[PDB]
Structure 1
Amino acid sequence: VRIFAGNDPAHTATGSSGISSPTPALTPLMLDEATGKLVVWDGQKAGSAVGILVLPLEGTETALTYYKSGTFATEAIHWPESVDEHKKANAFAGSALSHAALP
């Protein structure tokens, strides 16, 4: 089993959270245009996921911690149900993050 299907160093960062309900670690994150806060990636756009949640959230925190770089194992991330496969594969394209098979 794995999480970091890569050698390129994984770094973390903090940011204002806009998540209200409980969300588990390893959930892709995106920015909420209206508020500028981080929330779960909705899977609507490739390149929109700008981070991966490090630790799980209750849904009441004002801040959160996420991975801003690194190569992750696709199978370890909590993807939104029914997400488009192409947008999934290119979810982090543009950031320092990326993902692939374990193997």
Structure 2
Amino acid sequence: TSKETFTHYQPQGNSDPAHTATAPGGLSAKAPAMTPLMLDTSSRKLVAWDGTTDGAAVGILAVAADQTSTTLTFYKSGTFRYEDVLWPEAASDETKKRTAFAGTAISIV
């Protein structure tokens, strides 16, 4: 419990001391946590990963979310457990998902 601050709120500027991202939510259905997700380019929203799109995974959802989620809290980087991460069946090749975070600061094993 601690809230004390007052400054000219500005829509241009966002930074958190944590190592996670918080999107305004833009899913289309309910999805469990501990899984990779994809970030839109135009709508700039965070939605569950398709499973096919190569290099679509941008981060892993920390807490399960749904299309009704107004805010999604997913990771940004760090070594995560693949044996636990619930990858989408769409992934026909094991190497496909294992390399879904190609380009980001995320490294899964």
TM-score normalised to structure 2 length: 0.73
2:21 pairs with 1:19: no
Partner of 1:63 in structure 2? 71
Structure 2: state its 5+ residue gaps: 1-17
Q: Using the TM superposition, give the Cα deviation of residue 47 of structure 1 relative to its aligned residue in structure 2, in angstroms.
A: 2.1
Moved over 3 A (4+): none
Comparing 89-98 with 55-64, greater Cα deviation is found at 55-64
2:104 pairs with 1:92: no
Distance (Å, rounded) in 1 between the aligned partners of 2:60 and 2:73: 8
Q: Using the TM superposition, give the Cα deviation of residue 82 of structure 1 relative to its aligned residue in structure 2, in angstroms.
A: 3.9
Q: Using the TM superposition, give the Cα deviation of residue 33 of structure 1 relative to its aligned residue in structure 2, in angstroms.
A: 4.0
1:37 to 9, 22, 45: 45
Higher strand proportion (structure 1 or 2):
1
Structure 1: state its 5+ residue gaps: 1-9
Let me know the Cα RMSD of the aligned residues: 1.8
Q: Secondary structure of the equivalent of 2:96?
A: helix
Can you list the C-alpha shifts for 1:46-85, whole angstroms capped at 9, x where unaligned?
A: 3220010011114311220010000111111111114032
Partner of 1:5 in structure 2? none
Structure having greater relative contact order (Cα 8 Å, sep ≥ 6): 1
Q: Secondary structure of the equivalent of 2:57?
A: coil
Count of residues paired in the alignment: 91
Partner of 1:4 in structure 2? none
AA at the equivalent of 2:75: Y
Change (3 A) 1:79 1:64: same
Q: Using the TM superposition, give the Cα deviation of residue 34 of structure 1 relative to its aligned residue in structure 2, in angstroms.
A: 5.0
Give the structure with higher Rg (CA): 2
